[PDB]
Design a binder for these strands. Structure first.
Ligand SMILES: Nc1nc2c(ncn2[C@@H]2O[C@H](COP(=O)(O)OP(=O)(O)OP(=O)(O)O)[C@@H](O)[C@H]2O)c(=O)[nH]1
Ligand SMILES: [Mg+2]
Lengths: 81, 84, 532, 74, 299, 597, 134
RNA sequence: GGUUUCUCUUCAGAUCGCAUAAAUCUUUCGCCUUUUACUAAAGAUUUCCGUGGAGAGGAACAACCCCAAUUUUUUGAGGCCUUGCUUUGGCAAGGCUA
């Protein structure tokens, strides 16, 4: 069981931003992210690497095609590892 | 078995399989290379080692930066752990 | 000192910027009136909820602490008296945390008024029924009350350990009592209601099976998901939709039949839920030293040598936490049925907002955006620790309240054409409620409850708050029509007739604080109070 | 082990999904697999230039499933 | 600021300074290896366990990545300095493992001494001993040469023995210690070996290809020993200017390696002094004694 | 540490000092006079460790002077509280039965050794005699095996790495079958109450309400007062006193110190297990048919088949290998609703005296058809009980002084191990020693004391003679509590001497703890003692009631001396301090002299 | 009861306990108070030494029987553990070495070394009357 | 390092100690000769039977063969060009391949 996957599972309810394999950055309140990081969320605002925009009331994010995940600073305060 | 948890809690710059040089405080290693970094910066344009003209540029703020093992490329020690 | 208010904010699982986030969100909000019959599990259940929520609050293993009920009088009186504001963040089996605004109301008759006061500020309602008492007075009258005040209704069948360790039935007979309670509830609604089918059948997911002294809460779906957690590869909805009904389960095909395969076989619910809960309660209460380590390992559950040596109630409450995990089934069922303030405001503005549902203010409240006019509706009040001053308590219906602003407050008998029943004040502060402590904020949008300092002086019972500048079309939301009527009477007189202004002030304080209390100044100059 | 794709929520509905290589389609999600490979009917592909090709039902490459988003509200 | 660190509850026979000047490895009868910082708040991060006996000798490799740990459990274990793990054990000694030293600049060779009378050589990748010099008596101190070809061992036989690895034959014997020779240490130039004697006569002996044949180069008097029968090892300055010695006289002695004068007689300990190590970059002195407490003196 | 000395040491030195009248000593006399003062601590500490007659004989550590000058009992009586209540349930059953069966209950013949009959030496007789096997009532071996092996041991589980902390016998933990067995053995001293709906009007709140309002409830206590238009009244039924107690703010004008009634505990459904077969979870006859009944059920958009669904198969129910119930699960469920001494598994140890095995039958509300005599007994107990309910502050201040620690810290005193009854006989020996010492110290060759603590005059004393023959309540009170000791310890002396019975012993000790006001006389010196005199007679009456219910009647033999002994040691706890002050003063007068000025 | 091997050490032990009864029932008419109780302490020492030497000297009474004698008080646990130390081999009793019973703050004269007790000085324990226990 | 048993010192009970003793005063009351003793209320204050918390010091007892088609050691994301934007470098698009 992964510590980063666990932090991601916790990330539900807070803001999450996802850089994809193509390099787009999407932001939204994370609902449920599985062990395989398949992030099925809602109200995603995604900006593409060239500057174009897009937004959806819902979104799905395949796991193996995730480039990065940045959450709000609520997490920075599990330290036992 | 300490290959990550030895410098864990330390600052390190890890180059991704895409190339961004993310320098931050290591939050945990992983069997897959599942990595987390707190107080995170990422470098794209250059990595400063006494760069007189510029040293901190093409720098994105990540903060909590959680990356998986697929996008893991290389690691080096870059920072001493924050006393926080 | 009369209350239990603390100032140190204890350890949370969530974060404060994220709480401001969810208040900004305007979709994950569900404002519920948690009501039930006399001693049916309301505040011990919310005790289970807060016990889950905060890592440092547990039961004290001998008596369950009532975090919710805030009064020395209540803790001494042992019964339900006043509605209590609580604010929690709760995730579902998906994990999606939810902004639940609970009004843990009383289950007593003489205090239906605070239950109405939490109803008038609510969008959904949750009725707590003892498994062993049956359908009783306030069960009936509060269900009808929520129906005709147009509240979404949800059922929680609590205290089934009263069935498993006190009545001690066969699982089929506890399920007989279970369908007894659920069908009687649904029938009483279908009597009290219009063509809107609020028939509560847990296959639709409007019923929670729970045990609040012993830390159990789940719906058919939630148990299906605990299964699909044990053996990953089962599906939530279609296992739970075969978890209620007269359907049997044939394991030579491994398939559920709607015909009984043999003469002696047990239904899906009977063998999948009402079997293992009887199993757990028995094996944990009766045979601890012999084979209970085996039972815990067969359950995958791991308890310390400190936890095994514990008393029977610490052990069972602890194992039930260990087993059901997070209390997600309650919140799954409520988010499943309870409208969010957006889809709760239209019936609220309909029955509530006098000025009209379809209008400028009416439609700004229907959309309930944080940028309409300020419309706050105050139909409760809560005093400070010394009790000297009140705080005005309601929710937001339009706009956003900011501390530091002045407001025009308009009361019961105020209308537009008169302009003679008003007052102007500055609002002092803003809080988000928790039974013992409040989190003071700066900007509160529509869609959430509110506690406000300073405007309690021009409150009699119920009022509305808007800004003085602009919006000369607002009427005050309809005052509350109670489930009962003031027939009981008291005649009071101080031993010192000269302190009489003070006793008068006090009767004014209680007329503001107890929402069903009326004061009369009789024809011989006596003080009388009309109550129930 | 053998986790299931959590697409029953997007199931029975239509979604606009990008598959790798600049590929974009839209169709009614009727199922999936444990490898996430989903056969979603009414596939209409919108090429990068705007060409519209309604091919009927097809499967979605799971390895190459870049990202799908539902075309309606929950 | 002499910086007294407490936490070693037993006699601290070894306190060894990392040649980079950042950390300390201290151990004794405590059986634990405390690894301390020198900067910050002088805080110890890890404790290393796995020796069931008293850790008779802590030492660093010239890189400072391997911590050699000779202990009375008949073991010369290796620790990874980064994590605190044991890597392997050099077992085979059939009496108390007394002394250990690392080959300098070379491929890792280890020299060890024990109370069976054997001086045993170790090439870590073989999990056993290669060559063994039974002197006739117990072995108390052993040290390498910088050429990694000759061994200098001090025992209770009043003779400091230099063996050549290739002849396997005793090439040099230094006489001049009148009691048990407790501890030796070769200098950073490899040119002179500082040696302690319970008879309290500190001797510097130069190893060169061409020698005066009587290497009683410099004699110090002051390292005062008594009943406790403690093994005593000594230290050289980073640049060879000072010579530091623990004793039993509750004080530490510092002589000038050149003029042989007692530059410092330093208080602070209440018991017999076990080891005094030199800070590799500044004039700082690390003192551990039978008082079981550690001083980071600066001079 | 003070290493231990032989019990023959103490027996030996005290046999030398049987009479401090052999010239050879010539100093141990003044020694014992100094020693006298602390006897009130020796008395309390001796009595406060009763041998507990579900056993035969107890040996204990004691603190005795190297010159035998005095002997205190140095040991604190901790017991595991469920063990306590279980043994006492066993004793209720056993003495219940022994008077049920003994055709004519001969009681003890009280003080049975002559005023001049010298006291027995343990070494003389009780060193030798057999223990007269004890009261013990037999356990059913299969069902009582949980507690079978260790129940009637003295400090049962002191050396139990599984159950108590250690030799301290602190901090017990048990197993649930043993818990159900202890519940069974104590079932007769345990109320069957699960809710607080019994004491609605009978609880602390309403009874302090009644105290301050000067109001009274039918079956409740009474107290002093803390202090001391007709036309328009509408009357159908009367505004009553219990109404002014249940709603004490409304129908009560001018409330003072008035508590908040109406605590409503849900009327709990509890169904008892009677015979074993009866699986623990089966529809009991008393429960009523369910008959789930209403209109049409409803529809849901249920997931019809033929569209698609199917599971890959690992699944089994969350408990499948586990059976539903066990054989002792009924007893385990009773372990979910039992009194507190039997609802638990783990806790800390208390003293033998703070366990009211009898408390709530005289807390019970309306026994309804008793003689008014015992009814008033119950009300007196509610009286004193409401008093010590209303009257508990926290300690409010604390020093943890250690006194026997300080004593044994000295060379002059030592410890040993002998028989409790040897301790008692030596106690009465030394006590009369010191008393006659005091007399002959005051040169009273014209007065004497017996061994049964009656001061006998050799002649009719003259003006000055009988004038001086007056003694202060200090002397008298020590004398008469020492006579309480003579009585109880010589009663156990008779039982160990084998000359009545174990059950006759217990009835005689209860005879003491019920008729001391017929045996010692201390009230005469301290008229407040009559309050405990009341409590004595009250509890004697009540336990005669609940004793003489079956085949036993108004006869002699009720063996229950837990409670009387308990409140007695309460009284002694209060008085030994004051007594010691008075002793110190009299002694100072007696040696340093009356303060001249 | 005790474990096996009892009936062979029960006779001598009950005999030492009868000696204890006599040493308890003797009066002290005209005798020193310590000469009245030193027989008691000494016979207790004899029984203690019997059981303790059966334990550690002869091992004829095993851990089981010796522990039974310890718990049931036929063996002096303190005296056994005291002879289980150096310098305290031949001790008569423990007060003879415990400072608590010392007015001049010095142990019993029964423990002065034969080199530091005068030639012919009869070592005299004030507590047990011993003759020298170093 | 772990458990256990004792010793000694420090500190803490505005609800605790689901246990409940004694005194003192200082206010009201009666027993009704006097002092008592009491009465039987209050207010408070002390003492006792326990207790808590922190440490310190010693003793006993367990111990030091096969595999990768969504997340990294099989991954077939390969190449070129035209256009544009850029101070050049460089970067954006499409197309063609085999
Ligand atoms: N046996 C059993 N008792 C319970 C359970 N849950 C709560 N209780 C008890 O039932 C009693 C009912 O009290 P509450 O839980 O506060 O009931 P309520 O619905 O809040 O009623 P009010 O607040 O008085 O209006 C309490 O004493 C609880 O301790 C349970 O699961 N099993
Ligand atoms: Mg409640």
């Amino acid at each position: 069981i992964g510590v980063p996957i666990k932090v991601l599972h916790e990330a539900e309810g807070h803001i999450v931003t996802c850089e994809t394999n193509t390099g787009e950055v999407y932001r939204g309140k994370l609902i449920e992210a599985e062990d395989n990081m398949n992030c099925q969320m809602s109200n995603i605002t995604v900006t593409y690497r060239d500057g174009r925009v897009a937004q959806l009331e819902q979104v799905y994010i395949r796991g193996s095609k995730i480039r990065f995940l940045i959450l709000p600073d609520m997490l920075k305060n599990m330290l036992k590892s | 078995s300490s290959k990550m948890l030895q410098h864990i809690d330390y600052r390190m710059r890890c180059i991704l399989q895409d190339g961004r040089i993310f320098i931050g405080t290591f939050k945990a290693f992983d069997k897959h290379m599942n990595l987390i970094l707190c107080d995170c910066d990422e470098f794209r344009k250059i990595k400063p080692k006494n760069s007189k003209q510029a040293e901190r540029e093409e720098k994105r703020v990540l903060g909590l930066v959680l990356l998986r093992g697929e996008n893991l490329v290389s690691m080096t020690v870059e920072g001493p752990p924050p006393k926080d | 000192k009369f209350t239990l208010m603390e100032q140190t904010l204890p350890v949370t699982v969530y974060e404060m910027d994220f709480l401001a986030d969810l208040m900004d969100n305007s979709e994950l909000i569900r404002n519920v009136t948690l009501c039930g019959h006399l001693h049916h599990g309301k505040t011990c259940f919310v005790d289970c909820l807060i016990e889950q929520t905060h890592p440092e609050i547990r039961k004290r293993y001998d008596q369950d602490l009532c975090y919710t009920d805030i009064l020395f009088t209540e803790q001494e009186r042992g019964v339900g008296i006043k509605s209590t504001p609580v604010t929690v963040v709760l995730p579902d089996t998906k994990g999606k945390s939810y902004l639940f605004n609970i009004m843990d109301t009383p289950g007593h008759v003489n205090f239906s008024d605070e239950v109405t006061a939490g109803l008038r500020i609510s969008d959904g309602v949750v009725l707590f029924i003892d498994a062993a008492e049956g359908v009783m007075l306030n069960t009936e009258r509060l269900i009808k009350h929520a129906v005709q005040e147009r509240l979404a209704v949800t059922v929680c069948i609590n205290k089934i350990d009263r069935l498993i360790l006190e009545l001690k039935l066969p699982p089929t007979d506890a399920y007989y009592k279970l369908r007894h309670i659920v069908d009687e509830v649904n029938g009483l609604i279908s009597m009290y209601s219009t063509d809107e089918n609020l028939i509560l059948s847990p296959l639709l997911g409007n019923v929670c099976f729970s045990s609040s002294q012993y830390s159990i809460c789940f719906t058919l779906g939630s148990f299906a998901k605990i299964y699909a957690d044990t053996f990953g590869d089962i599906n939530y909805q279609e296992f739970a939709k075969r978890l209620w009904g007269d359907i049997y389960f044939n394991p030579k095909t491994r398939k559920f039949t709607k015909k009984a395969p043999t003469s002696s076989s047990q239904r899906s619910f009977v063998e999948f839920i009402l079997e293992p809960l009887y199993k757990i309660l028995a094996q944990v209460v009766g045979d601890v030293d012999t084979s209970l380590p085996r039972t815990l390992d067969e359950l995958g559950i791991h308890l310390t040598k400190e936890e095994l040596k514990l008393n029977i109630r610490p052990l069972l409450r602890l194992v039930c936490k260990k087993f059901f995990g997070e209390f997600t089934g309650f919140v799954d069922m409520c988010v499943q049925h309870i409208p969010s303030p957006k889809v709760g405001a239209k019936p609220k503005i309909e029955h509530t907002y006098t000025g009209g549902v379809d209008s400028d203010l009416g439609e700004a409240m229907s959309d309930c955006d944080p940028d309409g006019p300020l419309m706050c509706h105050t139909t409760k009040m809560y005093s400070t620790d010394d009790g000297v001053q009140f705080h005005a308590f309601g929710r937001v219906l339009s706009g956003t309240i900011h501390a530091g602003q002045p407001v025009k407050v308009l009361g019961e008998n105020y209308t537009l054409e008169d302009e003679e029943d008003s007052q102007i004040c500055t609002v002092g502060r803003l809080w988000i409620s928790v039974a013992r402590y409040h989190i003071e904020v700066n900007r509160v949008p529509a869609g959430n409850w509110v506690l406000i300092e300073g405007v309690d002086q021009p409150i009699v019972k119920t009022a509305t708050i808007t800004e003085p500048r602009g919006n000369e079309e607002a009427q005050i939301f309809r005052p509350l029509k109670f489930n009962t009527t003031s027939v009981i009477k008291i005649a009071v007189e101080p031993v010192n007739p000269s302190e009489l202004p003070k006793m008068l002030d006090g009767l004014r304080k209680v007329n503001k604080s107890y929402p069903s209390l009326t004061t009369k100044v009789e024809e011989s100059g006596e003080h009388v109070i009309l109550g129930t | 082990k053998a986790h299931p794709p959590e697409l029953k929520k997007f199931m029975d509905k239509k979604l606009s999904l990008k598959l790798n290589g600049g590929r974009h389609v839209q169709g009614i999600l009727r199922g999936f697999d444990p490898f996430m490979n989903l056969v979603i009917d009414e596939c209409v592909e919108m090429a990068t230039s705007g060409q519209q090709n309604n091919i009927g039902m097809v499967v979605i490459r799971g390895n190459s499933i870049i990202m799908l988003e539902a075309l309606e509200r929950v | 600021p002499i910086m007294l660190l407490s936490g070693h509850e037993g006699e601290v026979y070894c306190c060894k300074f990392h040649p980079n000047g950042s950390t300390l490895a201290s151990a004794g009868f405590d059986r634990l290896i405390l690894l301390w910082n020198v900067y910050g708040d002088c805080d110890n991060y890890a404790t290393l366990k796995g020796h069931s006996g008293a850790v008779m000798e802590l030492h660093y490799n010239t890189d400072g990545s391997m911590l050699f740990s000779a202990s009375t459990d008949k073991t010369v274990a290796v620790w990874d300095s980064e994590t605190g793990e044991r890597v392997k054990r050099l077992k085979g000694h059939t009496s108390f493992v007394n002394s250990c030293y690392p080959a300098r600049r070379g491929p890792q060779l280890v020299c060890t001494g024990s109370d069976d009378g054997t001086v045993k050589l170790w090439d870590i990748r073989k999990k056993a001993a290669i060559q063994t010099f039974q002197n006739t008596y117990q072995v108390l101190a052993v040290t390498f040469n910088d050429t990694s070809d000759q061994i200098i061992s001090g025992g209770i036989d009043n003779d400091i023995k230099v063996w050549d690895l290739r002849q396997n034959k005793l090439t040099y014997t230094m006489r001049g210690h009148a009691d048990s020779v407790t501890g030796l240490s070769l200098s950073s130039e490899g040119s002179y070996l500082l040696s302690n004697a319970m008879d309290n006569t500190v001797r510097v002996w130069d190893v060169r290809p061409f020698a005066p044949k009587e290497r009683c180069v410099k004699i110090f008097q002051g390292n005062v020993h008594n009943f406790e029968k403690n093994l005593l090892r000594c230290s050289w300055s980073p640049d060879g200017s000072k010579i530091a010695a623990g004793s039993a006289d509750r004080f530490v002695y510092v002589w000038d390696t050149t003029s042989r004068r007692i530059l410092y007689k330093l208080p602070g300990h209440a018991g017999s002094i076990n080891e005094v190590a030199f800070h590799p970059d500044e004039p700082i002195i690390i003192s551990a004694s039978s008082d079981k407490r550690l001083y980071m003196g600066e001079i | 540490q003070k290493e231990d000395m032989p019990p023959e040491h103490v027996r030996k030195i005290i046999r030398d000092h049987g009479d401090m009248t052999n010239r050879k000593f010539r100093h141990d006399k003044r020694v014992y006079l100094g020693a006298l003062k602390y006897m009130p601590h020796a008395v309390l500490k001796l009595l406060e460790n009763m041998p507990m007659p579900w056993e035969q004989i107890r040996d204990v550590p004691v603190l005795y002077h190297i010159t035998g000058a005095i002997s205190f009992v140095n040991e604190i009586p901790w017991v595991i509280e469920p063990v306590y209540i279980s043994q006492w349930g066993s004793m209720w059953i056993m003495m219940r039965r022994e008077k049920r069966d003994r055709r004519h209950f001969k009681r003890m013949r009280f003080p049975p050794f002559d005023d001049e009959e010298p006291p027995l030496d343990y070494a003389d007789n009780i060193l030798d005699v057999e223990p007269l096997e004890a009261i013990q009532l037999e356990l059913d071996p299969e069902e009582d095996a949980p507690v079978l092996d260790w129940f009637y041991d003295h400090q049962p589980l002191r050396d139990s790495r599984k159950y108590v902390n250690g030799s301290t016998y602190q901090r017990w933990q048990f197993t649930l079958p043993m818990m159900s067995t202890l519940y069974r053995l104590a079932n007769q001293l345990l109320t069957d109450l699960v809710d607080d709906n019994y004491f609605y009007l009978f609880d602390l709140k309403a009874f302090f309400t009644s105290k301050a309002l000067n109001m009274a409830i039918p079956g409740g206590p009474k107290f002093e007062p803390l202090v001391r238009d007709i036309n328009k009244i509408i009357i159908r039924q009367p505004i009553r006193t219990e109404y002014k107690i249940a709603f004490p703010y409304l129908y009560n004008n001018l409330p003072h110190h008035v508590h908040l009634t109406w605590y409503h505990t849900p009327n709990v459904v509890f169904i008892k297990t009677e015979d074993p077969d009866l699986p623990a979870f089966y529809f009991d006859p008393l429960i009523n048919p369910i008959s789930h009944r209403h209109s049409v059920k409803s529809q849901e958009p249920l997931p019809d088949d033929d569209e698609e669904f199917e599971l890959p198969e690992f699944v089994e129910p969350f408990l499948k290998d586990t059976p539903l119930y066990t054989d002792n699960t009924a007893n385990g469920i009773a372990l979910l609703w039992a009194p507190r001494p039997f609802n638990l598994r783990s806790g800390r140890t208390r003293r033998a005296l703070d366990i009211p095995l009898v408390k709530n039958w005289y807390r019970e509300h309306c026994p309804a058809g008793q003689p008014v005599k015992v009814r008033v007994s119950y009300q007196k107990l509610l009286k004193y009980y409401v008093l010590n309910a209303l009257k508990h502050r926290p300690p409010k201040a604390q020093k943890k002084r250690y006194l026997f620690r300080s004593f044994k810290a000295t060379k002059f005193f030592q410890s040993t191990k002998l028989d409790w009854v040897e301790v008692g006989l030596q106690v009465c020996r030394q006590g009369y020693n010191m008393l006659n010492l005091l007399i002959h110290r005051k040169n009273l060759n014209y007065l004497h004391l017996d061994y049964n603590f009656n001061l006998k005059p050799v002649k009719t004393l003259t003006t000055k003679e009988r004038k001086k023959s007056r003694f202060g309540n200090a002397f008298h009170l020590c004398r008469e509590v020492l006579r309480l000791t003579k009585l109880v310890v010589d009663s156990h002396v008779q039982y160990r001497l084998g000359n009545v019975d174990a059950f006759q012993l217990a009835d005689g000790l209860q005879y003491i703890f019920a008729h001391v006001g017929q045996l010692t006389g201390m009230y005469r010196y301290k008229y407040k003692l009559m309050r405990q005199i009341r409590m004595c007679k009250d509890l004697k009456h009540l336990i005669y009631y609940r004793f003489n219910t079956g085949p036993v009647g108004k006869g002699p033999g009720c063996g229950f001396w837990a409670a009387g002994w308990r409140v007695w040691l309460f009284f002694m706890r209060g008085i030994t301090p004051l007594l010691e002050r008075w002793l110190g003063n009299l002694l100072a007068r007696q040696f340093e002299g009356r303060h001249s000025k | 009861a005790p474990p096996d091997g009892w009936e062979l050490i029960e006779p001598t032990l009950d005999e030492l306990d009868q000696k204890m009864r006599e040493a308890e029932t003797e009066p002290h008419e005209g005798k020193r108070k310590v000469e009245s109780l030193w027989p008691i302490f000494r016979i207790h020492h004899q029984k203690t030494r019997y059981i303790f030497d059966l334990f550690y000297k002869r091992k004829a009474i095993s851990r089981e029987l010796y522990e039974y004698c310890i718990k049931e008080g036929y063996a002096d646990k303190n005296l056994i553990a005291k002879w289980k130390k150096q310098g305290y081999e031949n001790l008569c009793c423990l007060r003879c070495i415990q400072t608590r019973d010392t007015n001049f703050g010095t142990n019993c004269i029964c423990r002065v070394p034969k080199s530091k007790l005068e030639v012919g000085r009869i070592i005299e324990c004030t507590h047990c009357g011993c003759r020298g226990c170093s």
